[PDB]
């Protein structure tokens, strides 16, 4: 029922940027968890937002490098990737769930199909 | 609380969805197929949403789970959870569990869900003061005193019960994601004081 719309990716250089974009249609939430996982090992979390709120939730080591956004409106949110390193590399999975403390457990989420980021140098 | 001897999946797990959810949890070709306690002791998740279970007995021999996902099942009873000591995250939403009580030792219980179970009398959750999120959505309730014991909540759903007093509220002061709508609610002066709030839902009340 929840369709996620997900774009960016891609190979970019090491110490460059990449922004990606996820839009979610088809639910009936007021506010709702949406935010990037990503799987190289098991997969992990990387952000989230709380949609219709404010709070973020950032994995340590992508903290201060990646900035998670959101248009409320348009049911989308933004991850801003800066100053990408080697270890960044993995595809990246939108993901929502109603509640972010649940959202955490990946297990009972809507998942997107995902994009290959590769990170090069 | 522990199997002395390897001893089929089939024998320690009556219930056949149960039994079916093991074997595949284990990856292991039979529930005819031999467990031993250390094999059972390596699991910490089990994934067992919309599986017919009418009951997880044998579960309690899995001293290790942390993650058990039971939304959707048939249980009533959950008296087989009740010396499941590192319990962290329970989801029980659609059963029919009423008896709150086998609740009462999980310590390190972190999450609970019991959405559209049919309750109206919470006050087994007293015993869960530890708790950081509780889902209590769509279900009867009316009388939440209890939940002033839970002072480390920060996610709480009561939306879709018949709550008309939100004052046990009033002290939850790390609460920051509240979900009312769909109750009774006039009344939200004992919130005014709740300063961490992110998400506060009253959509939809049906005064009286």
Same mark, same amino acid.
Request: charged share 20%.
């Given at each position: ?19 990606? @974009? ?7 939430? @007021? ?29 340590? @080591? ?60 | ?146 939940? !002033? ?7 709480? !759903? ?5 709550? !008309? ?20 609610? !006039? ?22």
């Amino acid at each position: 029922q929840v369709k996620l719309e997900e774009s960016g990716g891609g190979s970019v250089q090491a110490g460059g940027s990449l922004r990606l @974009s996820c839009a979610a249609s088809g639910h009936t939430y @007021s506010t709702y968890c949406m935010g990037w996982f990503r799987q190289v090992k098991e997969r992990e979390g990387v952000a989230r937002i709380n949609v219709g709120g404010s709070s973020t939730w950032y994995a340590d @080591s992508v903290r201060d490098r990646f900035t998670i956004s959101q248009d409320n409106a348009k049911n989308t949110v933004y991850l801003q990737m800066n100053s990408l390193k080697l270890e960044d590399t993995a595809i990246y999975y939108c993901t929502l769930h109603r509640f972010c403390n649940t959202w955490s457990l990946g297990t009972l989420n809507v998942w997107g199909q995902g994009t290959q980021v590769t990170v090069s140098s | 609380e522990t199997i002395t001897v390897s001893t089929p999946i089939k024998q320690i797990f009556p219930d056949d969805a149960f039994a079916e959810t093991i074997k595949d949890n284990l990856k292991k070709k039979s529930v005819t197929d031999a467990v031993t306690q250390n094999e059972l002791n390596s699991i910490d998740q089990i994934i067992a949403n919309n599986s017919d279970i009418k009951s997880v007995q044998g579960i309690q021999y899995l001293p290790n789970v942390t993650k058990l996902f039971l939304n959707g099942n048939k249980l009533t009873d959950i008296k087989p959870l009740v010396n499941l000591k590192n319990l962290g995250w329970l989801f029980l939403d659609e059963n029919k569990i009423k008896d709150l009580s086998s609740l009462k030792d999980l310590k390190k219980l972190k999450s609970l869900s019991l959405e559209h179970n049919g309750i109206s009398d919470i006050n087994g959750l007293v015993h869960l003061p530890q708790l950081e999120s509780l889902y209590l959505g769509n279900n009867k309730i009316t009388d939440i005193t209890v939940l !002033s014991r839970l002072t480390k909540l920060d996610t709480l !759903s009561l939306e879709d019960n018949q709550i !008309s007093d939100i004052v046990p509220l009033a002290g939850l002061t790390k609460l920051q994601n509240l979900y009312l709508s769909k109750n009774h609610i !006039s009344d939200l002066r004992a919130l005014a004081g709740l300063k961490n709030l992110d998400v506060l839902e009253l959509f939809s009340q049906e005064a009286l």
